[PDB]
Design an enzyme around this catalytic site. Structure first.
Site, PDB file in Angstrom:
ATOM      1  N   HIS A 223       9.340  -7.912   1.725  1.00 21.81           N
ATOM      2  CA  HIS A 223       9.191  -6.453   1.525  1.00 21.81           C
ATOM      3  C   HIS A 223      10.519  -5.765   1.831  1.00 21.81           C
ATOM      4  O   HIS A 223      11.207  -6.151   2.778  1.00 21.81           O
ATOM      5  CB  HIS A 223       8.054  -5.931   2.418  1.00 21.81           C
ATOM      6  CG  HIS A 223       7.532  -4.588   2.028  1.00 21.81           C
ATOM      7  ND1 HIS A 223       8.132  -3.406   2.450  1.00 21.81           N
ATOM      8  CD2 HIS A 223       6.478  -4.232   1.254  1.00 21.81           C
ATOM      9  CE1 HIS A 223       7.468  -2.378   1.958  1.00 21.81           C
ATOM     10  NE2 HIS A 223       6.441  -2.860   1.224  1.00 21.81           N
TER      11      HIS A 223
ATOM     12  N   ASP B 122       0.865  -1.200   0.000  1.00 19.70           N
ATOM     13  CA  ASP B 122       0.000   0.000   0.000  1.00 19.70           C
ATOM     14  C   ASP B 122       0.890   1.235   0.000  1.00 19.70           C
ATOM     15  O   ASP B 122       2.097   1.142   0.194  1.00 19.70           O
ATOM     16  CB  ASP B 122      -0.983  -0.081   1.169  1.00 19.70           C
ATOM     17  CG  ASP B 122      -0.373   0.079   2.546  1.00 19.70           C
ATOM     18  OD1 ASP B 122       0.810  -0.256   2.732  1.00 19.70           O
ATOM     19  OD2 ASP B 122      -1.102   0.532   3.422  1.00 19.70           O
TER      20      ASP B 122
ATOM     21  N   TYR C  61       2.904   4.833   0.801  1.00 17.61           N
ATOM     22  CA  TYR C  61       3.607   5.520   1.913  1.00 17.61           C
ATOM     23  C   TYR C  61       2.565   6.124   2.853  1.00 17.61           C
ATOM     24  O   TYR C  61       1.661   6.818   2.413  1.00 17.61           O
ATOM     25  CB  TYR C  61       4.564   6.591   1.379  1.00 17.61           C
ATOM     26  CG  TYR C  61       5.815   6.066   0.710  1.00 17.61           C
ATOM     27  CD1 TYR C  61       6.720   5.267   1.401  1.00 17.61           C
ATOM     28  CD2 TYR C  61       6.114   6.391  -0.604  1.00 17.61           C
ATOM     29  CE1 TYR C  61       7.884   4.805   0.806  1.00 17.61           C
ATOM     30  CE2 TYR C  61       7.276   5.945  -1.212  1.00 17.61           C
ATOM     31  CZ  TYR C  61       8.165   5.148  -0.507  1.00 17.61           C
ATOM     32  OH  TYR C  61       9.297   4.683  -1.110  1.00 17.61           O
TER      33      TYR C  61
ATOM     34  N   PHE D 153       6.426   3.070  -4.255  1.00 18.28           N
ATOM     35  CA  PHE D 153       7.791   3.317  -3.718  1.00 18.28           C
ATOM     36  C   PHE D 153       8.367   4.649  -4.237  1.00 18.28           C
ATOM     37  O   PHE D 153       9.375   5.117  -3.667  1.00 18.28           O
ATOM     38  CB  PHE D 153       8.680   2.098  -3.982  1.00 18.28           C
ATOM     39  CG  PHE D 153       8.179   0.830  -3.325  1.00 18.28           C
ATOM     40  CD1 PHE D 153       8.375   0.612  -1.971  1.00 18.28           C
ATOM     41  CD2 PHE D 153       7.503  -0.137  -4.052  1.00 18.28           C
ATOM     42  CE1 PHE D 153       7.927  -0.552  -1.362  1.00 18.28           C
ATOM     43  CE2 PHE D 153       7.040  -1.293  -3.438  1.00 18.28           C
ATOM     44  CZ  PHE D 153       7.256  -1.500  -2.095  1.00 18.28           C
TER      45      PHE D 153
HETATM   46  O1  LIG Z   1       5.408   2.521   3.015  1.00 19.84           O
HETATM   47  C1  LIG Z   1       6.197   2.021   2.228  1.00 19.84           C
HETATM   48  O2  LIG Z   1       7.410   1.915   2.394  1.00 19.84           O
HETATM   49  C2  LIG Z   1       5.607   1.423   0.967  1.00 19.84           C
HETATM   50  N1  LIG Z   1       5.379   0.073   0.963  1.00 19.84           N
HETATM   51  C3  LIG Z   1       4.832  -0.565  -0.125  1.00 19.84           C
HETATM   52  O3  LIG Z   1       4.621  -1.767  -0.128  1.00 19.84           O
HETATM   53  N2  LIG Z   1       4.533   0.236  -1.202  1.00 19.84           N
HETATM   54  C4  LIG Z   1       4.734   1.594  -1.300  1.00 19.84           C
HETATM   55  O4  LIG Z   1       4.408   2.211  -2.309  1.00 19.84           O
HETATM   56  C5  LIG Z   1       5.273   2.183  -0.171  1.00 19.84           C
HETATM   57  F1  LIG Z   1       5.488   3.510  -0.210  1.00 19.84           F
END
Ligand SMILES: O=C(O)c1[nH]c(=O)[nH]c(=O)c1F
Length: 228
Positions: free
Chosen positions: A192, A69, A71, A82
């Protein structure tokens, strides 16, 4: 917003057609987000960026990157998984971890910034399993109806008469694994890049070089991963 307008206006032509089976679900998500604002809860990214990953050409996608999901920090999420605005510093920890693996894997210098749009402009779909989040609350929109939309997006890509490599980052991304059974599609699965899970096998996973070897093996052009 996606409450107001049809897919034909919100996303790229190929995506509009690919997402036709979830046109109503997309409208439903627009209503979910309106109800959130009405109740006085916030969401990220900005409404106009929620479907941004689908504004790059459907037919040009060769690599799919799927996170969990957006940020959760206001000012970070831009609708591309990301990615951050070119003026964002420091980089969020996930992106710092991705770029450390990027340099280890490909031998390139650290990127100048956290702007991933060159990847999106070069056939990399920067997708999240769930396309909104409540600020400061990771996973807060899990199970609210985005999963059907990103499932449809993945089925549609895998049905193209085209090669595809999937990089699935973390446990929510990996639930797309079954819908990637098509023969022209291969899945890379890892933990992740988030600090909580990165050391469980994100570091040294070499997703970028492996993606390109897999593309080459299917007679596809490799991705140019190099960021300025
Ligand atoms: O909060 C994160 O680091 C994060 N983690 C994710 O899996 N996707 C993102 O787009 C993201 F920004």
């Amino acid at each position: 917003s996606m409450t107001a307008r049809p897919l034909s206006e919100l996303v790229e032509r190929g995506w509009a057609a690919a997402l036709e089976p979830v046109a109503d679900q997309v409208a439903h998500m627009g209503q979910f987000l309106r109800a959130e604002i009405a109740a006085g809860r916030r969401y990220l990214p900005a409404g106009s960026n929620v479907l941004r990953a689908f504004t790059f050409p459907f037919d040009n996608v060769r690599v799919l990157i799927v996170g969990q999901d957006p940020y959760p920090t206001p000012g970070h999420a831009v609708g591309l998984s990301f990615s951050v605005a070119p003026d964002v510093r420091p980089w969020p920890r996930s992106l710092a971890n991705i770029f450390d693996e990027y340099t280890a894997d490909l031998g390139y210098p650290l990127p100048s910034n956290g702007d991933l749009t060159p990847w999106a402009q070069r056939g990399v779909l920067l997708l999240n399993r769930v396309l909104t989040v409540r600020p400061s609350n990771p996973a807060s929109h899990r199970g609210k109806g985005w999963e059907a939309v990103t499932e449809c997006a993945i089925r549609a890509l895998a049905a193209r008469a085209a090669p595809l490599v999937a990089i699935l980052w973390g446990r929510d991304a990996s639930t797309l694994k079954p819908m990637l059974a098509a023969g022209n599609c291969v899945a890379i699965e890892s933990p992740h890049p988030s600090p909580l899970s990165a050391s469980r096998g994100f570091f040294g996973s070499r997703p970028f070089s492996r993606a390109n070897e897999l593309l080459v093996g299917m007679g596809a052009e490799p991705i140019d991963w190099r960021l300025p």
